[PDB]
Design a protein around this ligand. Structure first.
Ligand code: HEC
Ligand code: HEC
Length: 123
Protein backbone atom coordinates (compact mmCIF):
# COMPACT_ATOMS: atom_id res chain seq x y z
CA UNK A 1 0.00 0.00 0.00
CA UNK A 2 1.13 3.60 -0.49
CA UNK A 3 3.08 5.51 2.10
CA UNK A 4 0.19 7.78 3.04
CA UNK A 5 -2.37 4.99 3.69
CA UNK A 6 -2.25 5.16 7.50
CA UNK A 7 -2.06 8.93 7.38
CA UNK A 8 -5.17 9.14 5.24
CA UNK A 9 -7.09 6.93 7.64
CA UNK A 10 -5.96 8.66 10.83
CA UNK A 11 -5.87 12.23 9.61
CA UNK A 12 -8.81 11.97 7.26
CA UNK A 13 -11.24 11.03 10.06
CA UNK A 14 -12.74 14.45 10.84
CA UNK A 15 -11.68 16.46 7.75
CA UNK A 16 -9.88 15.61 4.51
CA UNK A 17 -6.37 14.33 4.76
CA UNK A 18 -4.22 17.36 4.04
CA UNK A 19 -1.25 16.60 1.74
CA UNK A 20 2.00 16.64 3.68
CA UNK A 21 3.55 19.16 1.27
CA UNK A 22 1.23 21.93 2.47
CA UNK A 23 3.35 22.62 5.57
CA UNK A 24 7.02 22.44 6.43
CA UNK A 25 8.26 19.92 8.94
CA UNK A 26 8.41 22.14 11.99
CA UNK A 27 4.82 23.17 11.50
CA UNK A 28 3.71 19.52 11.24
CA UNK A 29 5.65 18.70 14.42
CA UNK A 30 3.89 21.53 16.22
CA UNK A 31 0.59 19.79 15.36
CA UNK A 32 1.58 16.22 16.12
CA UNK A 33 3.31 17.08 19.45
CA UNK A 34 -0.04 17.73 21.16
CA UNK A 35 -2.82 16.12 19.13
CA UNK A 36 -4.95 16.07 22.28
CA UNK A 37 -5.31 19.85 21.89
CA UNK A 38 -6.17 20.07 18.18
CA UNK A 39 -8.00 23.17 17.11
CA UNK A 40 -10.90 22.55 19.52
CA UNK A 41 -10.95 18.75 19.11
CA UNK A 42 -8.94 15.87 20.53
CA UNK A 43 -7.08 14.11 17.75
CA UNK A 44 -4.88 12.04 20.04
CA UNK A 45 -3.67 8.70 18.79
CA UNK A 46 -1.81 5.80 20.35
CA UNK A 47 1.89 6.72 20.64
CA UNK A 48 3.30 4.37 17.96
CA UNK A 49 0.65 5.51 15.46
CA UNK A 50 1.46 9.13 16.38
CA UNK A 51 5.11 8.49 15.73
CA UNK A 52 4.52 6.95 12.28
CA UNK A 53 2.24 9.89 11.36
CA UNK A 54 4.80 12.46 12.47
CA UNK A 55 7.56 10.64 10.65
CA UNK A 56 5.47 10.49 7.44
CA UNK A 57 4.62 14.21 7.61
CA UNK A 58 8.14 15.33 8.39
CA UNK A 59 9.66 13.27 5.59
CA UNK A 60 7.15 14.44 2.97
CA UNK A 61 6.76 18.03 4.19
CA UNK A 62 7.12 21.14 2.18
CA UNK A 63 10.84 21.73 1.77
CA UNK A 64 0.30 24.99 16.10
CA UNK A 65 -0.54 26.96 13.01
CA UNK A 66 -3.12 26.20 10.38
CA UNK A 67 -2.58 25.86 6.61
CA UNK A 68 -5.16 28.60 6.16
CA UNK A 69 -2.94 30.96 8.18
CA UNK A 70 0.09 30.54 5.97
CA UNK A 71 1.03 33.43 3.77
CA UNK A 72 0.99 31.32 0.57
CA UNK A 73 -2.57 30.28 1.30
CA UNK A 74 -3.81 33.80 2.20
CA UNK A 75 -2.29 35.18 -1.03
CA UNK A 76 -3.87 32.55 -3.20
CA UNK A 77 -7.35 33.11 -1.71
CA UNK A 78 -7.43 36.87 -1.14
CA UNK A 79 -9.78 37.69 -4.07
CA UNK A 80 -12.49 35.27 -2.85
CA UNK A 81 -15.23 37.19 -1.03
CA UNK A 82 -16.79 36.31 2.25
CA UNK A 83 -20.24 35.61 0.66
CA UNK A 84 -18.68 32.57 -0.93
CA UNK A 85 -16.91 31.28 2.23
CA UNK A 86 -17.73 32.48 5.74
CA UNK A 87 -21.24 33.53 4.72
CA UNK A 88 -21.79 30.50 2.51
CA UNK A 89 -23.40 27.69 4.58
CA UNK A 90 -22.20 25.10 2.12
CA UNK A 91 -18.53 26.11 2.80
CA UNK A 92 -18.25 28.22 6.05
CA UNK A 93 -14.47 28.36 6.13
CA UNK A 94 -11.50 27.53 4.01
CA UNK A 95 -10.35 24.60 6.13
CA UNK A 96 -12.19 21.84 4.30
CA UNK A 97 -10.46 22.35 0.99
CA UNK A 98 -12.31 19.49 -0.72
CA UNK A 99 -15.56 21.47 -0.64
CA UNK A 100 -14.12 23.60 -3.47
CA UNK A 101 -11.14 21.55 -4.70
CA UNK A 102 -12.84 18.22 -5.15
CA UNK A 103 -9.50 16.34 -5.53
CA UNK A 104 -7.63 18.16 -2.79
CA UNK A 105 -6.76 14.87 -1.12
CA UNK A 106 -4.86 13.87 -4.33
CA UNK A 107 -3.04 17.19 -4.20
CA UNK A 108 -5.03 18.79 -7.01
CA UNK A 109 -5.82 22.42 -6.27
CA UNK A 110 -5.77 23.86 -9.77
CA UNK A 111 -7.87 27.00 -10.22
CA UNK A 112 -9.35 25.69 -13.46
CA UNK A 113 -11.14 22.86 -11.65
CA UNK A 114 -12.30 24.71 -8.53
CA UNK A 115 -16.10 24.65 -8.03
CA UNK A 116 -17.50 26.55 -5.06
CA UNK A 117 -20.70 24.97 -3.72
CA UNK A 118 -23.60 27.23 -4.37
CA UNK A 119 -21.63 29.38 -6.84
CA UNK A 120 -20.22 27.04 -9.51
CA UNK A 121 -16.95 26.78 -11.31
CA UNK A 122 -14.60 29.65 -10.58
CA UNK A 123 -13.10 29.82 -14.05
C1 HEC B 1 -11.17 15.04 14.74
C2 HEC B 1 -11.13 14.31 16.08
C3 HEC B 1 -9.85 15.36 14.10
C4 HEC B 1 -8.89 14.48 13.76
C5 HEC B 1 -8.86 12.94 13.86
C6 HEC B 1 -7.89 15.27 13.12
N1 HEC B 1 -8.21 16.58 13.08
FE1 HEC B 1 -7.17 18.05 12.20
N2 HEC B 1 -8.60 19.35 12.70
C7 HEC B 1 -9.71 19.08 13.44
C8 HEC B 1 -10.50 20.31 13.61
C9 HEC B 1 -11.72 20.49 14.48
C10 HEC B 1 -9.85 21.29 12.96
C11 HEC B 1 -10.27 22.71 12.87
C12 HEC B 1 -11.14 23.01 11.59
C13 HEC B 1 -11.66 24.44 11.66
O1 HEC B 1 -12.58 24.54 10.67
O2 HEC B 1 -10.75 25.32 12.03
C14 HEC B 1 -8.69 20.65 12.37
C15 HEC B 1 -7.75 21.30 11.61
C16 HEC B 1 -6.56 20.82 11.12
C17 HEC B 1 -5.58 21.56 10.34
C18 HEC B 1 -5.73 22.99 9.98
C19 HEC B 1 -6.63 23.18 8.78
C20 HEC B 1 -6.59 24.65 8.34
O3 HEC B 1 -7.57 25.40 8.51
O4 HEC B 1 -5.53 25.07 7.82
C21 HEC B 1 -4.59 20.69 10.07
C22 HEC B 1 -3.32 20.97 9.30
C23 HEC B 1 -4.93 19.43 10.71
N3 HEC B 1 -6.13 19.52 11.30
C24 HEC B 1 -4.15 18.28 10.66
C25 HEC B 1 -4.48 17.05 11.16
C26 HEC B 1 -3.65 15.87 11.20
C27 HEC B 1 -2.23 15.85 10.65
C28 HEC B 1 -4.36 14.88 11.78
C29 HEC B 1 -3.96 13.44 12.12
C30 HEC B 1 -2.80 13.45 13.14
C31 HEC B 1 -5.63 15.42 12.10
N4 HEC B 1 -5.68 16.76 11.77
C32 HEC B 1 -6.70 14.75 12.67
C33 HEC B 1 -10.11 17.87 13.90
C34 HEC B 1 -9.43 16.66 13.73
C1 HEC C 1 -13.56 27.57 -1.73
C2 HEC C 1 -14.25 28.54 -0.77
C3 HEC C 1 -12.11 27.28 -1.43
C4 HEC C 1 -11.61 26.61 -0.32
C5 HEC C 1 -12.35 26.02 0.85
C6 HEC C 1 -10.23 26.52 -0.60
N1 HEC C 1 -9.90 27.07 -1.78
FE1 HEC C 1 -8.10 27.03 -2.68
N2 HEC C 1 -8.82 28.18 -4.17
C7 HEC C 1 -10.12 28.56 -4.32
C8 HEC C 1 -10.24 29.41 -5.47
C9 HEC C 1 -11.52 30.04 -5.93
C10 HEC C 1 -9.00 29.57 -6.00
C11 HEC C 1 -8.65 30.40 -7.22
C12 HEC C 1 -8.53 31.88 -6.74
C13 HEC C 1 -8.52 32.90 -7.87
O1 HEC C 1 -8.51 34.16 -7.44
O2 HEC C 1 -7.63 32.35 -8.77
C14 HEC C 1 -8.12 28.72 -5.17
C15 HEC C 1 -6.80 28.47 -5.47
C16 HEC C 1 -5.94 27.61 -4.73
C17 HEC C 1 -4.60 27.29 -5.11
C18 HEC C 1 -3.89 27.74 -6.35
C19 HEC C 1 -4.45 26.96 -7.53
C20 HEC C 1 -3.90 27.32 -8.90
O3 HEC C 1 -4.34 26.90 -9.97
O4 HEC C 1 -2.78 27.94 -8.90
C21 HEC C 1 -4.13 26.47 -4.15
C22 HEC C 1 -2.76 25.80 -4.04
C23 HEC C 1 -5.21 26.27 -3.19
N3 HEC C 1 -6.33 26.95 -3.60
C24 HEC C 1 -5.14 25.55 -2.04
C25 HEC C 1 -6.07 25.39 -1.07
C26 HEC C 1 -6.00 24.66 0.13
C27 HEC C 1 -4.71 23.90 0.52
C28 HEC C 1 -7.16 24.79 0.77
C29 HEC C 1 -7.65 24.15 2.09
C30 HEC C 1 -6.64 24.40 3.29
C31 HEC C 1 -8.05 25.54 -0.05
N4 HEC C 1 -7.36 25.91 -1.17
C32 HEC C 1 -9.39 25.84 0.28
C33 HEC C 1 -11.14 28.26 -3.52
C34 HEC C 1 -11.06 27.54 -2.33
Amino acid sequence: IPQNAEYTAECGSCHMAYPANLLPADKWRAITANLENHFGDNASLDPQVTARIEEYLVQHAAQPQKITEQAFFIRKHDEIPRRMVQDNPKVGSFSQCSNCHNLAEKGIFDEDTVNIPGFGRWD
